[PDB]
């Protein structure tokens with residue numbers, strides 16, 4: 187893969203406008219609602235039997251903040267996402283056994299959340315740059331499986 | 333599959349607020365820009381060499397409207413989508429050789445467009461209902477392949 | 479979907495030459511080794527820390543037999559697989575939260591086992607018929623999710 | 625990703641036993657039969673309306689030889705598949721617009737062909753190493769899309 191100058195500017199600029207205290211909870215909660223099977227990894231977070239219980243769960247909100255903060259840090263290292271996520275790859279693959287397909291699923295739900303918050307600013311080109319980011323993150327986090 | 337009565341209500345209600353004349357071209361054009369390989373099915377549609385050419389292309393806008401008007405008719409048959417799409421399955425599978433993976437891709441681009449147009453109104457539960465609709469439509473259209 | 483009379487004949491004839499007592503453990507064990515993340519669904523099955531432990535594990539062999547005996551019964555109902563697998567869909571979706579992508583994965587590991595056991599006899603046309611069967615079984619088992 | 629010493633030895637040793645004058649035609653032909661949509665890229669090869677016509681087509685056999693010869697060369701460069709396939713990535717993505725999902729589809733059909741020819745020698749571990757190879761090749765060839 188390869189980010190263009192335009193890709194980097196679009197990723198960096200849009201991300202600077204995200205609130206990583208609500209976006210993270212919103213993204214992980216939406217993943218858990220829309221694709222229910224993912225709840226299996228988070229049986230320690232409490233009751234996730236309904237949308238309201240998930241979107242209102244403080245451990246979901248707290249953990250989504252970690253997720254997006256680590257992604258925000260990675261956006262400082264676009265040309266080296268493999269190395270930047272090496273340690274989290276080890277955690278997610280070797281220790282938690284998260285299905286590699288889930289990384290792209292979460293990335294697509296972040297794209298949905300960006301489209302909700304930014305609307306018409308999320309043009310096809312802007313979405314293309316973010317789809318490249320989703321793919322790249324998923325590859326970096328599944329590296330230990332490959 | 334199975335649509336709950338709440339899935340049907342969501343699907344029909346949100347669709348009634350969709351302007352097909354705008355959403356059609358916006359959905360097909362977004363698919364062509366974001367996932368460029370799909371342009372190979374539309375060589376006769378003329379200039380697709382840049383995002384601005386795709387989003388300005390009269391044939392892309394006219395075709396997207398056909399697509400979304402076909403999906404509007406399908407929403408009147410939610411609990412018989414395979415029978416509803418039998419003719420278009422034959423067209424897309426036996427005659428055009430569309431990759432079944434692309435039906436899922438276009439339905440995901442429509443989810444993105446709905447998120448852009450409705451923002452917050454596109455809640456996690458509303459997205460779940462539409463995610464089941466995209467899957468159901470993909471399955472119905474690739475039925476000739478199965 | 480749709481099974482041709484030649485798909486049914488292929489499926490039933492090749493299956494009649496399959497030894498389930500061997501193929502069962504061989505298929506589940508291959509899935510656990512090749513796609514290690516799926517081991518997380520089988521923590522109670524004991525030692526799955528190495529390929530030799532998985533392929534020697536008595537619980538994996540006993541479970542694989544259940545799996546393949548379930549698929550043998552399904553082959554007697556090829557043109558009603560969704561109804562046939564309704565109970566196991568509820569089990570795998572509502573109770574175990576299996577990722578629908580893993581049903582496709584296991585059916586692909588079975589294709590590999592059939593290729594190993596039958597060699598040349600597993601022609602391109604015979605594989606096509608079995609590829610439709612894996613897809614049909616995945617769709618039927620993930621039906622609760624749709 | 626990362627090949628282990630064991631991965632490299634397994635890939636290199638099994639590949640040294642493949643016949644790249646028949647395996648290539650067998651792999652591309654099987655892809656065209658099993659997953660019909662792929663035939664769309666090869667409308668220049670002649671009649672592909674049936675298994676017999678595909679498996680007997682001299683242009684299929686001739687082109688599959690190219691495919692596997694380029695893969696054989698890549699197996700000399702396991703630690704640098706991105707650079708080794710850079711030029712073919714440009715051809716397949718920028719010029720032919722091949723769907724990225726097809727690269728993994730072809731890789732899985734090569735795995736089926738290896739299982740047919742090598743049988744019990746294709747153990748779960750041996751298949752794991754080859755699945756890692758399939759993923760890595762698909763990533764290298766789709767790089768221009770990412």
Ligand code: HEM
Pocket residue numbers: 224227228230252253254256257274277278282284285288289290292293323327
């Ligand atoms: C954008 C991709 C993702 C990133 C950046 C990410 C990041 C993180 C981080 C930073 C942690 C915390 C580790 C610590 O606290 O030391 C974590 C834990 C975890 N992640 Fe992820 N993650 C990602 C995707 C996923 C996906 C797709 C899954 C499964 C669907 C997943 C499941 C988990 C689990 C089960 C934990 C342990 C949490 C606990 O102990 O309660 N993650 N992740």
Ligand code: HEM
Pocket residue numbers: 370373374376398399402403420424428430434435436438439469473
């Ligand atoms: C939401 C899924 C889809 C639906 C509901 C849909 C619906 C339609 C309909 C109704 C037509 C007929 C147009 C007319 O009568 O002139 C059509 C034509 C076509 N569709 Fe789709 N389609 C879908 C997905 C796809 C995808 C994923 C592709 C491939 C990237 C595709 C490629 C085509 C092509 C090439 C035509 C013929 C266009 C022309 O040259 O006239 N469709 N589709």
Ligand code: HEM
Pocket residue numbers: 516519520522544545548549566570574576580581582584585615619
């Ligand atoms: C070819 C697709 C599959 C079929 C036909 C199938 C069939 C079965 C059947 C018949 C049982 C019941 C066993 C008994 O009565 O004791 C079962 C249990 C189960 N299956 Fe599947 N299954 C399939 C795919 C999967 C996949 C992809 C996974 C996840 C990696 C999975 C995870 C499980 C689990 C965790 C159990 C419960 C086992 C235990 O703890 O007792 N299955 N399956």
Ligand code: HEM
Pocket residue numbers: 662665666668690691692694695712715716720722723726727728730731761765
């Ligand atoms: C293991 C992965 C693959 C490799 C190593 C590979 C390699 C090659 C090579 C060496 C060529 C010849 C270029 C030349 O003659 O200068 C080629 C051409 C081509 N490939 Fe691939 N390929 C791969 C996968 C694919 C897939 C998945 C598709 C689509 C399903 C595809 C479609 C094509 C087409 C359409 C051509 C042009 C052939 C013609 O002009 O008639 N390839 N490939």
